[PDB]
Design a protein around this ligand. Structure first.
Ligand SMILES: NCCc1ccc(O)cc1
Length: 174
């Protein structure tokens, strides 16, 4: 019942010795294989310090901004998130399947909110690349698409490895 013998993962990671300190920071979830997760728009995960997680998302009109907080535990590529009672539908085991640390990562996991399985693509969110161009209604959405496009070859190559294509994912940030 630990991460060591978690059975819901379907794929072998390309990053079994994931460097958690390098993985840490803010990530925006661009797309994934779960229809249910399309209801949580422009989700940003913020992994910080030893084991902290702050997750923030909206509905599809950008209304009802929601924040859930939790604790993580990493063993190589595997990680659990235990959310505060609030986001318990998202508490699950997860696995980083691929990342270049600096730009993108592809993650699998088994939350109830995803009908027990999802693979998703996330791009790094940093003020070094994100200049809220004051006047933009679609701040997040434009950032995400540009970051996707900029890293598209690498993302597509890794997805191919897990028998997926970007175009087959549901977009989860416009
Ligand atoms: N810690 C992220 C949990 C999650 C994964 C994928 C997604 O589209 C929304 C939430």
């Amino acid at each position: 019942d630990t991460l060591a013998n978690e059975d819901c993962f379907r794929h072998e990671s390309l990053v079994p010795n994931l460097d958690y300190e390098r993985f840490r920071g803010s990530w925006i979830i661009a797309a994934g294989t779960s229809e249910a997760l399309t209801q949580y728009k422009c989700w940003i995960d913020r992994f910080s310090y030893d084991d902290a997680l702050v997750s923030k998302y909206t509905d599809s009109q950008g209304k009802n901004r929601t924040t859930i907080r939790g604790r993580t535990k990493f063993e190589g590529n595997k990680f659990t998130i235990d959310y505060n009672d609030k986001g318990k539908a998202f508490s699950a085991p997860y696995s980083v399947l691929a990342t270049d640390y600096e730009n993108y990562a592809i993650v699998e996991g088994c939350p109830a909110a995803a009908n027990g399985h999802v693979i998703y693509v996330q791009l790094r969110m940093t003020l070094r690349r994100f200049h809220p161009k004051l006047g933009d209604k679609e701040m997040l959405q434009h950032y995400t698409l540009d970051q996707v496009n900029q890293n598209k070859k690498a993302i597509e190559e890794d997805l191919k490895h897990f028998n997926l294509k970007y175009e087959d994912l549901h977009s989860t940030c416009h």
